[PDB]
Design a protein around this ligand. Structure first.
Ligand SMILES: Cc1nc2c3ccccc3nc(NNC(=O)CCC(=O)O)n2n1
Ligand SMILES: Cc1nc2c3ccccc3nc(NNC(=O)CCC(=O)O)n2n1
Ligand SMILES: [Zn+2]
Ligand SMILES: [Zn+2]
Lengths: 332, 329
């Protein structure tokens, strides 16, 4: 209870100290990237830390609009797709867009451009930069078409953020990122990280949530706290590969489900940070035990399916988290 | 006494599928022949219809927006709402020196419209069989003028986050003579107004379920209908010649700012809510002060625009209506 705000205090102090040096490089990369006719409309999506415990690790996403796409779902995976349709003809491999070819010149253009003042050296997160500062550059195809049919009954936020917001969110473009599946080397996975940022910073039922003292939720604090919890446990057992396949996308997804089941702002009063976090920890454990964690936008996709993560990893993380929660979280 | 009001709302809602469908075929064709002329190439329709008179469902009004990239405005004679257009372009044919001619562009707009039909800010009125008013609007994706810096004060009602979203949207300029001065453009935020009306609650789920049914949208229609009815009952008296639905809509935006909580607009208290609406509007009429919601230093009820006799005439009329359970309904 009081220890959590202690943890939240030492986390916020890591933001008073490099993101300018990040902008100086990515703005130089984007210029020469726009010179190539294949990456003409390239631009930034939203710096963003995927790891809360790594304030020197940044993550960017370079978007590129592909006009008039038609997708083909790869073997009922509901998340991975082929790209049919043109300044991308050089990257064709038949009538599909080769995720391998298009990403190869992307790596090459970056490698050529970073040599003139950095050591770009590394899937979808194709290139990582070393500046004692890290940024990972992801290439994303933008499609202003309607969302795929696998996302029809996803983003169920009507009782929390309203249906007209859901309608407006679904009018936004969606993004595709080169992810291999099973590998099949030319598949692209859907991505709504732009929608997720819209949800976290516009998170209340009331429009004035977290804008005044009487309406101060504790959502963002709960997500930071369980994000930091997994990042810590991944570091404690890093040299043992137990928690290798768990990432922040899991805890962020479990957070979105808790936001829907607890739609009212009154259920997130900052006075109850302890119980709120304890309820967040419980739901995530319930997904570990029942081996079921739907993708928040693609509900037919189980992030915790037996094909992606084994039962032994879930049981181990369960034992770790349960031990932390019973001992006032010593890993913090 | 809300029994009569809900009867009026019942009759206004029972009013129109074939009307708008006839307009959509004509407006779409006009926008295509316009798109051929080099001057009006990037022209689209803003707010992709709007009944300026809530009681006249056979009359629509569209806003043909035209993207103007190079914009450097010159505020005219401290009006803070009328401006001159400088270009810091295909509209070169309509320049009067450095000033973009609202006169030459109008006569241009007048001409090409009348060609494809083979009546005269609302540049043209067309008559289908139902009439539609078409206005031309320059769109500027630049930051809003400094006269709007202290306007749109919704931070305690819709949140400051929403205010920042709104101000990042483009603003629109329409031709409007000012005094007259023949080549001025007036500011326009009707796109922002529409956003506020259909997204009116402090809660994002307002009027979306039985628990959160408000009466904001009901009070504005009743207010608009009250003015339009008194304007017809005294159309020959010529005293209400200058009162329009924009005055009612502006005053409604002030009472939403003044009453930001959704619980203050419950649908059970429609009676008191409408009574509190008309009282603020009468208070504006007596004190002769009604700030523009976006341009706060612009008084819509200044003595230079409307004379004191007109405000007192309308004041006595609304009070006589409010004192006798609104017989004009
Ligand atoms: C940013 C992002 N977007 C998605 C995503 C989108 C749709 C469906 C499943 C998805 N799963 C994951 N992560 N799953 C992992 O195990 C991480 C390692 C990896 O994927 O290589 N992410 N991460
Ligand atoms: C759609 C719209 N936009 C504005 C507007 C914008 C900025 C400043 C003043 C403004 N005044 C008005 N209405 N004025 C009247 O009601 C009198 C008659 C008239 O002005 O023609 N409107 N109406
Ligand atoms: Zn909040
Ligand atoms: Zn409402």
């Amino acid at each position: 209870a009081s220890k959590l705000r202690a943890v939240l205090e030492k986390l916020k102090l890591s933001r008073d100290d490099a993101a300018g040096m990040v902008k100086g490089v990515v703005d130089h990369l984007l210029l020469r990237l726009k010179c190539d006719s294949a990456f003409r409309g390239v631009g930034l999506l939203n710096y963003e830390h995927v790891k809360i415990s790594a304030p020197n690790e940044f993550d960017v996403m370079f978007k590129l609009e592909v006009p008039r796409i038609q997708l083909e779902e790869y073997s009922n995976t509901r998340a991975y797709y082929f790209v049919k349709f043109n300044p991308l003809s050089q990257f064709l491999e038949g009538e599909i867009l080769s995720a391998s070819k298009m990403l190869s010149k992307f790596r090459k253009i970056i490698k050529e451009e970073i040599n003139d003042i950095v050591i770009m050296k590394r899937g979808s997160p194709a290139v990582t930069l070393l500046i004692k500062i890290s940024v990972d550059i992801t290439l994303a195809l933008e499609s202003k078409s309607s969302w795929p049919a696998s996302t029809q009954e996803g983003l169920r936020i009507q009782n929390w953020l309203s249906a007209k917001v859901r309608k407006q969110l679904r009018l936004k473009p969606f993004y595709l990122v080169p992810k291999h599946a099973k590998f099949q080397e030319e598949t692209w996975r859907l991505s709504f990280s732009h929608i997720e940022k819209e949800i976290l910073n516009n998170h209340g039922k009331s429009k004035t949530c977290c804008e005044n003292k009487e309406e101060k939720c504790c959502r963002k604090d709960c997500l930071k706290l369980m994000k930091y919890l997994l990042e810590q446990l991944k570091e404690r057992f890093k040299d043992k590969k137990h928690l290798d396949k768990f990432s922040s996308y899991h805890v962020k997804t479990a957070f979105f489900h808790v936001c829907t089941q607890n739609p009212q702002d009154s259920q997130w009063d900052r006075k109850d940070l302890g119980l709120c976090f304890d309820n967040c920890v419980t739901y995530f454990l319930q997904c570990l035990r029942t081996e079921k964690l739907e993708n928040y936008f693609i509900p037919e996709f189980n992030l915790f399916s037996s094909n992606l993560i084994d039962k032994r990893s879930k049981e181990f993380l369960t034992k770790q988290i349960e031990y932390e929660r019973n001992n006032e979280f010593p890993v913090f």
